[model samples]
Target: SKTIRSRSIWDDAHAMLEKAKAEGISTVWDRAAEQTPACKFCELGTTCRNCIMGPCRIANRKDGKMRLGVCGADADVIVARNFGRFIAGGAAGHSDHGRDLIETLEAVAEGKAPGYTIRDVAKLRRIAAELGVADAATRPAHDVAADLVTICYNDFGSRRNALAFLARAPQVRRDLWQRLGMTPRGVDREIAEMMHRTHMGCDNDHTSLLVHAARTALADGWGGSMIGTELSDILFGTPRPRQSTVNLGVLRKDAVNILVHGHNPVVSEMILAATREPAVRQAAQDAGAADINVAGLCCTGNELLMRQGIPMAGNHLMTELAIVTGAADAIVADYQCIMPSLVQIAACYHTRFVTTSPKGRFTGATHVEVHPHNAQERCREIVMLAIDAYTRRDPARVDIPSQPVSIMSGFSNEAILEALGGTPKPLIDAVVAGQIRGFVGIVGCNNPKIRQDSANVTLTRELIRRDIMVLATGCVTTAAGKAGLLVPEAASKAGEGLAAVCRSLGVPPVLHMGSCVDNSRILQLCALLATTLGVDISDLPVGASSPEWYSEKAAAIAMYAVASGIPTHLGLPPNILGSENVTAMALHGLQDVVGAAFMVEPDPVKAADMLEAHIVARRARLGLT
Candidate 1:
């Protein structure tokens, strides 16, 4: 037996050893190189002849025996669609989150929701001006903001250029997208088209896939993610540097533990309002609890924890453990990234699982319709119900043993730039000197196949350690935070060069950009920051990675990042095993078209190395190296 190598968080020292049945390394878990999926589609990655109608799986068949799939989609087309499909899936996943935000904002604007209202009036006006909401002076800025909010509220339903924030970009960069024919028509439009084009019978050509993939990816980063992030920051207060707790430890046995366990901020938004009320505290005590502990899971965790100093309960896969603690009173869910099995797991214990979204309602979970107009009141009601449920706890069946660790979340592109150069100048300056390298958004999910949190945590830590600033989102942010990498002083753990750079700038190494849908914030920030630095984003050394990314959302993020000229790396295959041609299109061919490209390395160490090297390569291209 030989010692295994662990490079990045996602790289279990064991994945490499698990490749083949050697008496030496343990060939555990599926997809360990040699023990690859029988991959009925194509194993050798050489299947495709679409324009000619021979979409065959030409996997070194002459030597052995392996034709292609029906569509003559040799390994290449199969892989291309497989990869493109992942990208499309990711785009829709993120855009869907943004759509919900627009809907929630509309509900709040119309006063149709009970508990929602304007929490950040000042920010509303500031953002309105930045977004160019109104040019008229007769109306007050507040009124302009209200009207602007109304406009933003209607953007999801819009047929064309409804995004006001596009005005926030430097004119040159904004024009680039418009001229390239890549500007998204609308959030839903882009997602829908991407899905349609990538299906089995539709556009099978890699180039066609690339075209829609570009549009879909950009739609999230530019349209959906950006608007949602901006409004959220305004309503929730732009995240300033803050310290908080993360991980399963935050759940309190003596308190009525409430976990915000989904993606949308609508319900999480309500929970934030209710948890702070004096009534909520008193209710918890009435239920024989010492206090109230409302932590978050997924991006909701990142949202509340970054905004209100809420502790994070867990990352993507810890849903069951949260309930297993037997301490959770309620795990409120909205839409996307939510586990379907939670309803049953909560039923096995004293935990009361609450479903909040109309789009996502699980069986056996308590349903509390969150009407847009009365969002706040409904939220308060939900919390109160959980507090009451806490009173009926069975002491004999309890296993409330858990704890939390320190986390530093909440890094908006706006706030991060402000910290760097004091009004974006310092950020521009860093780019000028090449001291603080371009950002790599290490965002997305964590797969249980690897040790939970290992992929995101190690990648972020290692990236920043090398002086590369990281902008992160989703469960990945929580994982970095749990490792204490996002703390203000976390700069100390970075490589001396990067730590000194951050110290001089007075910011943390990892920047928690926001929820998964909020990856758009990263895109906007990159564009604005690059333009602010007097360069096109394509010239910057920016790169991205998802060490433990296992969702279609991660793929969408990668496509956008690549299409936008920022190369992104993924630790696992993008279900592209069947198409070598498409895989090549994603990797090398797309680079000439987009500013960047994609690299798929199943091993975490290799993935991390690829990302680090790509960052340095981009820097070298800019003469920084």
Candidate 2:
């Protein structure tokens, strides 16, 4: 019980962990413990397996052993190359999500996607116009969408000199990127070039490699992720401020609980629609279940929470534990951050582990491939599957932890601006008057190495107490939500200035800004503020942090935030510590080069201190006193 309690901070999680232990079901923390004292070389990013040449590990021992790879690459070069690819993997995850959105939009434009239509035609036209779609306003929605599709598709091509959305940045920042040769031309181009550069004997200069790493991350931030967020708002409705609930308690014993996992809304959105169908509801009733309850897991949950007010079941580390609740009837997975352990965990129960995307197939799960054309039909089939699983569920084994907690979600940029009377001037004035100190986007995932969400929740509380408003995305959304900080009334816990602002606005101190991909919204908001102020984004009193992150996507997010001139904080460092030069360049040199750098501190309070200090310094630079 002591060990289980230490693994998580929530009563719900603690209960499920105890249940899983009593059942002898191994979880992520168990696996992490099994792999304790991780391989030193791999942990430091000192091992190179790019080729079969000895699978080299770099060391500077007293005996002078293994300082370079067989390819004559030193620790600095190898570490930089590895880090670049790490960013590439993260970039690819989000960029591919963008590509899926583009394909879905194209299908919609061509009238090929059933059960999918542009929910936010105003946003569609606005985005189309912003991207230079001709006759966007007067033309038919499909025609405008087709042209917008062409523009987004062009960003994925290699021929462009800059992404269409790069224009959103202040001209000075764009010029700085150009001067540093870090301007991302195309989404696929930068990613492909990164892969090519990291190949053996290519781009061996560590500094050069790191610069291109920033470029690849920029492509994700301004190009791929930006497009995904915009088009999602167009396809699914733009998220307005809405009330929702969070935690495992959202899972109901009487309902046919279907948990939508992963990062794509294309799959989860349709699954949600199918759950609302009359026939599907009847099927659940026939199965002796009260209703078809659709809850979210991870970013997909955030997506639905932002748009449809779907209650979240849990976040990353909670994925396995959610299944252990014995109420997750069917877990429909799409891609990224989903553990294969879910397959085994679901096997232990009557749970039906369902895989929807071809990109996200688990070996032992039911594969119901869904695309735009067949999503409506296929998602109904998935719900029926969940109903069947509910019929087989053992009431004797079920144990729901606690009552669901109330949370408010859905704070898109549009929603925020609308609350401010359609402009950022009010927010800007608040910052200037010291009613709000600055903004920090607390983003990213959970790692088992740390107590789940311990750092994420503490850092959020610390920042808000210091009067810095938090912009939350990804798994941090759940942490803030579960901590009862996502409610407008929680403003009482904040500093006087920020509490006044929250009370006046009737919003939470920590704003839930869409899914992980929607970190681009922060980039967009910073650009808006910077352009309005006639200064670079680096001149704004804004920062980003990922306190409990453990994925490649988090690394990509941290890198892009820094490249965009927002000093980013991480509770854990990336594996560049093997090369002092590489580590120095990341922590110190990049501040001189890009005006922002990474700050890594495991203690959330200390991380908050450093982030607050950076905000204070930036505020001073802006003459805000």
Candidate 3:
């Protein structure tokens, strides 16, 4: 049997894994073990099922049989096609999320979305003006928003030569993308084109397919994700630095625990608002609970934690284990990275597994679908369902784990610039003076195949020790928080230069940016820096890493990072190893095309070294020591 300690790095997770095992409850780790010997063909990206033309697998035999698909596709084409579709899936998830925000903003503008208002009108007008809305700063907020929505919506259509946010990139980078045909025009347009390109008997060239994949991912990073982040700020107030807590310990034994899972803050934000209602709190108190305690899980948790200062229960790997704690009265989910296993696991106890999105339905889940118009009412009903479930909880089975760890979150780009005295100049001076060597955005999710958050935490620790400040998002926020690295005091663990900078700025060495979708903030920051410095993004001493990633969204994020001229490190590789050419293009050839490449290293320390080396090279090119 695998030791429980080998399954995770946290004491809270260890306790819950033991509980799950002792109770004969299966977890992600258990299922990963069962699927340990994953099919070689599928793992290597050598299988093709896109068409019914024999559902082919390419293998080299001594007899020279089965070397290609029935349609004469080779391993390279199969791997590239599969990878293109994989990126498309991820792009669709985030882009669709962006589309949802557009609709929400539209509803708010139309006076239809009750309980939702333009919270960040400054950002709204600024973005509206930047996107060419006429009389943006002078017009009524909703009218400006309506025009901005039209512009953003046009970006999802087919008429543009480039995405609106591509204007943020340095001219050199824009020229490079335009020259290479990598400039993303529309979000959904590219996603749909990628689907068309990867279909059977279409776009068989591996190089061409991979290039389109980069374009598809760029549509997400600059088009869909940027819109999501900006519009979310306008709707749900841009995140500012705030202190919160993390871990399964955040679950309260006395309170009605409702864990919000998945992405999109639109649903989670309303649920948070509902929990604040006097009626909802009184209902929980009426049910013999102390309060309606809402904790976050995964990106949805990250969203709430960012804006509302809500305590996070856990991240991707801890979804099941949070239920295992026996204190979760409800697992309220919206979409993406929320396992259907949560529905079954919630059934093991009184925890009501509530799905809020029609797009994210599970067979056994309690569906109370939410849209902009009814989110206020729907989320109130969902919170009441949690209170009702709390009444059915067996006190004998309740196990609240360790104490929560304090985390400083909500470092939006605006917050960062404000901390830098209203500009990137101070940050630029620090980089020039070597008081901060570089920046690395450590983002992505947890996978059960690896000890949860091991690589993520270690790589984060290693980078800061080398004077590289980490900009964190998604699951890494929880990992860094639990490690005590999200407080200004944690600067003591960093290199002397980074520690000094943190002390002066009164910030943590690692900045908690926001949820996964907010990686666009990192993109925007890089663009701002590059534009200020009159240099391409590739000239900046910046890198990205996703050490414990599992989802297609993580893959899409990594792809966009690399394609944006930021060298990215991964602890594990994507499923393109069967084709050496595709692997080489990802690892080496792409550097020639986009000025950045993917570096795969399993050891966190080595991954740090690889990322640091790239940063050092970029710093030297920028005339810094």
Candidate 4:
């Protein structure tokens, strides 16, 4: 069966899959099989769910019947609308995460958040000064924070001419965005306009709809996501070089194991702190557990792992499987990409599935809604609840699939610069000397449709072996970590040129940047390099890839990458293939306008070739060998 074959890539995952099968539990693979022959119209982006006016599906045939929607929308219109809304959903998820960070900063400024003090006040002043807050460096922290909060809130408001952080883009790129009508005014405003434009009878022109979609995604990459990454650094302490482990073995049978799922670090950071408190440890001992263990799942795991060096339990496909180990005492979730099936999976074991954010709730989970003011206290209470659940764990059914692997993470841009001796000059000189041909930011999630991490790892290995350095984030971080490419010692697997650079810097050939929201860091890096070189971003030799992506946020990330002049690759085509015009616009036409476009190739080797071709061509243009 497809499930068995797809489960073959990871020994730890396959072990859980076998256990799940023995226990008669269904996973995403099984559900994917049941829905295998997915709806043709929906899969082809021909279905319309935007309105009540006759839920429509465009016909693939030339027949006049059902050729357009009730309101006279064609294939191109329907597909573009669907694609636009798809990107908006992704932008909203990241932007909403950013909005929450801004509110937290506001509360900090007002002295309302008691436990949430600025951990990186230097980052605060630098960012505040960068955004034009007067006297940012010399003012009181709260005073500077108030002005910074105002600046971020303005990016969320409707009055900004451009987002406060958009100034980071090179002058050439900024002028191009402005000339192309792609300047993101406000994070929320662009997302709101994107939805408004995609409304039925509002935007029938595919070209105009796509432009607005670029603007919306640009808001995510440059506005909401960048703000989220920066404010998170200031609030939770900038991530520095650290070491951690990954895989199902990170779960402990003798401990009160708690998995932090979802995206925000606001809750998970406190959860980690509470687990370390003497009181919480005492409660765990009283419950007959060895200790309290906190593991990460998905991007929230990335956030904690980035700053605190927390061990990762699993990624997107591994969430349900982690519970299948029958040792997870609790699963605490925040928002985005968390399966509702987790509640069901946790119920199968001696686990308490807890939802901490009002924004992210499952029907069958425990509700311990967290806010800025009460998170520290509430997180402690949640840890105590996990301790109580740990006592109910069934030893007969418990199995930790495999031993943990050594994975060194925490390669934030600041950490990357530090590793390069406080400058990007060495890295730039290497690239210019052809020792590093180019850079690719590999990101996004796993899909059951594709074997978990098969393409992600393959593409990373292929690119690095070709002397193209890999900057990894999202679920791919687990893949790279598990593949043993995240430590400085992994440089031996790289081509000679990249190996020398990696060894000299004492870093891995593939750098773990951070979570999905931190893809914004890649954007900032590109803009910085472009500005230093006095060129547009598209003129640089960098690319992006989401080999096994299955989320709209990944789509938004890919779209924004291409729109920002970085070529992007996807292992599978999006749902626009049914419309030739729309597919052409995405795959071919975008290159003409932005100097980059999307490449769809399931073969990782071929995808690596294409990415390298783009980078090599750019290198030739810059007079490099």
Candidate 5:
């Protein structure tokens, strides 16, 4: 690897190696190219359980280079099935989150919750109209909201295509989805059917399974994901890309360090709000802590990183690392992307892993079932657990040192829109005027096997330095925070103009938009930029990428962005090396509808180069380059 232009996330990862080398850290590279690293090319489409069964391949090898799983399903079925299942996992996450919100709204409406209320009235009305609650026009806002909640609540299990959110999508996209006959009948139905068809000795027809796959992804994009974003906006303010801080510098040395790790912000919202109380912070300090340093991890890290700019621990791989900081008083996790290792690793030191959700009760970890309605109280109790840990610190053995930086984060879809330009049309003008260059949501998870935050940090910094606005979501964004790349100081790392804009606004060069479900915010931002800004989304000089994503949510997000006409870059392609037919379709067949296809480049440098090229071409298309 060599020092290369800071152009893409992939490039940044390689460059990190160069920097590490400069620091006397020798870097070893992965093995042979044809090997596919983990041999993903082979196991991508099949439910091949190398741990349980043989590494079964789903596609037929024309060159006799591949084979099917023990189930004997062909490549197409396996490919479609694999794709569908990933989308299902992500879809369930989004839909279930939406359901949780509806329940919360009901509590708020009935005056059951003291603090929660409809925060964004305009968004509430807009969402109700889209959801088509009965008598929406005549009813009170909360009444109409109650009806809308019922609709969203049933979306997961409902077997109907009359989704209300479709109306909010641009006419062109809606028409295309209908024309392709890819409208999902129900959020859960498509996933169930995809499972049935892709099963061994099941529907062996590849193309047929693909149809179900498309619908499955659509269910996520339009039904589950969309519902979650809209309802979230109605509760919290709509996300317009706005600047906030990110990274590890946010931990309070004197305060109790409580790290929230999970997917949905249900419990997180409690912590975010509760931690703000003066008494709570004082109590924690009185409990032998100086202050309460509340940060986030995983999707919750994304949530806090983007919305509150609280900084974060690392991603999936960094969970243990955060605990090992020896500074971490407690690592509190609710659900999603959580590792069992927390129970194993945290016990090795003064760090404690607290599992807060009944939905996930891992033994050997502290169990604190979160009372949904008593969110703030529950939050206080959770913080108390960590505050207690702060006093339990073994100062003699603690090796904690300062490893933090300045950060400015936060930019949900609403904030992003505001940043692009307050007016819908102004967003278009900003892209045209170059005050705010087009953006790319550079987001995803972390693999400890690689440079901890190198890929995510370097890519985001380089892109911002290049004058590109980036609205990141999930763990990758948190990694940027850990590196101090999400603050106004980071603007210095940016290209000339971008630095000036960020400095003037007192904002960080990169914006963090929170969690995976928050990815729906990106889609909404794109659609608004296109429909409201009067530019076809495909024509906008904006892009997206997930360099180190290793989750099902990443697949659902990639698909939705492409379907919305925003060309999204996926660092790893699963369909490759499957059957020739499966590979062909992913790289080519769906282009007409989605406009972007999955691609894989093993070399980090090549992956970054491809994204840089795509972004530069988009700028050229818009005549900015």
Candidate 6:
């Protein structure tokens, strides 16, 4: 009797999971079951391990024992410190990823990065000028890009009064952040400061720690993630309307299947190009293969799907099962959300699990260190290894599930505006006319606790049927795609008003924005809407939800969305319920202060009702029907 759902809504995922179990292979769900009956102290966020003074656990027992850490930190302080560091960890991941993009731009400026050039010079000039770079339009592309890179780097450095992108937010919101001490000054600086504040003897105040947590998450949203998303658009041309496929069926039996997993496109983009090279394709054919098939996993999939219209194999929990299908030849990973267990799982098959970033190392895997200068050659080698592994793929073990589903992707803010005839007026008019009720950015990852994508798909359907448009990104993209909601036909499933808007624009009711980092695109859109309407973002009838969230990155995103005054919903509560005060602050206190707060509900219907209630209130406030 397995406690976990035996199959997901996705036939391909379910099939692979069955195969994995039949082979006696372990999966994330299996591990989740094994790790069930979680530690109460840790689950309640009352455990402290920040220092060796004591790896303490605060027990709220009947005896009233162990109420404080050895350092005298109470439950509120312990939970806040733990949460601040958790947010810092996520912020650092995105911030460091952002820094890598900046460094790449710098390399391109210096003529050191081969096989990389400015793909969107217009975006480069536009962004540079917006960042106050002198002579941005008249300067050489590299020079303008260099200046833009410097601007982004400064956001990571100590000198910025605030993140360069923070200017996009309304003045009122910015002032609010300043008043709340939530303004993110520098990306790395805030992360480092949070770490210092959480040290054994410093910053024992839970309120202060919570404030810095907001700042750290804001640094990620406005500083790190914003930079990463924009520069990726500049380097790999800003995504416009594109079509792609999804599911494990994207892997091919006759072709060399190389899945690009993880987040960053710095390595995956080059790998994609390598597979397309004449020599690489020829090598595949010569080795008794049809050709090279490149698929994506996770955010890496979202990036390539947006730009290149590449097929996605799957999302978060499907990484291991992708290999279990026995068709994956090599998985070229970059960093973030890449389960280390992938290395061990790949070892069980002919798949070669190759890690590119040093930060994402596994005990047993091939390490091909990738950098700007070496990416071209290294990616080529990675493709060749995939071809070699394809030769050894056991045909008896290969079982690609179902046909891939069609999905419309590449809904960049630019594309959205383009679809509306060069302005947001039509879309805004739709909202004002009540043709569209409101918008909800359904984002975040899949958690094993819930049936995979069950909550995500249900919430999306529930929202749009009520006339709210869904702007999707991250793992939710897969959920929408799997549910056939990412295609234009999905509009038929929407309310009459929303269906009219979707059909007229020839887009889906659920729009696919890019990767998790690209959630910055939503922030940018919200800011643009607020600026155009001459109101704060909190006034807009917009919200965010992470129904199947599982990671620290998801938490960071939820925090920033709430901090930005958008009502946010999560399927599971974070590990902060040990303190009634902290939980109340998150749920009720934030709404009163920031104009929005967190909502936690595991039931999709109840969550949808709560989200719709907030949107309806905002719509009425905006004087919409």
TM-score of each: 0.86, 0.99, 0.99, 0.99, 0.83, 0.99
TM-score of 5: 0.83
* Model 4: ten consecutive residues of lowest lDDT: 1-10
Off by over 4 Å in 3: none
Q: Per-residue lDDT of 97-155 in model 3, one digit per residue for the tens?
A: 99999999999999999999999999999999999999999999999999999999999
Instruction: lDDT winner between 3 and 6, please give it.
Output: 3
Can you give the lDDT of residue 533 in candidate 2? Answer: 94
TM-score of predicted model 4?
0.99
Candidate 6 residue lDDT tens string, 1-625: 2433454666777788878878889988888888998999889999998889889998867988899898888999999899889888888889988999998989999999989889999999999999999999999999999889889988989987889999999999999999998999999999999999999889998888988899999999999999999999999899998889999889989899999999999888999999999999999999999999999999999999999999999999888889999999999998989998898889898999898987888778899989998999999998999899999989999999889999999999999999999999999999998889999999999998888889999999999999999999999999899899999999999999999999999999999999999999999999999999999999999999999998889999999999998999999999999888788888998888789999999999999999999999998898877
Each model's total of backbone clashes: 40, 0, 0, 0, 32, 0
Clashes of 3: 0
Candidate 5 per-residue C-alpha lDDT over 113-217 given as tens digits, one digit per residue, 9 for 90 to 100: 656778788778767776676667677888877777777766766656646565556767777778877766676776777677655667677666665666776
Error of model 1, residue 457, in angstroms: 2.5
TM-score of 1: 0.86
Over 1-625, each residue of candidate 1 has an lDDT whose tens digit, in order, gives 2333332232212332322223221222222434454565444344444434554555555666555556544455456555655666666666667666666655655656666655666667766666666752345544564666566655555556635555655666567677666766676776677667655568767676667777777777777777777777755677777778876678777888888887767678788788779988888887788998898888887788767778887777665556655677888888777876667667766678888877778877788888677677888889987897787766665543434567666666656766665577766566557667667888888774566666676677777776778887887776777677877789987877667777886777787777876777777777776676666677777788887777777778778788777878877766564555667777888777666788876666666677777767767877775
lDDT by residue for model 2 (98-119), tens: 9999999999999999999999
Error of 6 at 456 (Å): 0.4
| lDDT for each candidate structure | 0.69, 0.94, 0.93, 0.92, 0.66, 0.92
Question: Model 5, stretches more than 4 Å misplaced?
Answer: 1-72, 133-141, 157-159, 237-245, 273-283, 419-421, 433-437, 465-467, 482-484, 488-509, 533-536, 602-605, 612-625
**Weakest ten-residue segment in model 3 by summed lDDT:** 1-10
Better structure of 1 and 5 per lDDT: 1
**Residue-wise lDDT of candidate 4 within 102-206, one digit each (tens)?**
999998999888679899999999999999999999999999999999999999999988888889888877888888899999999988998899888898999
* Cα lDDT, model 4, residue 159: 93
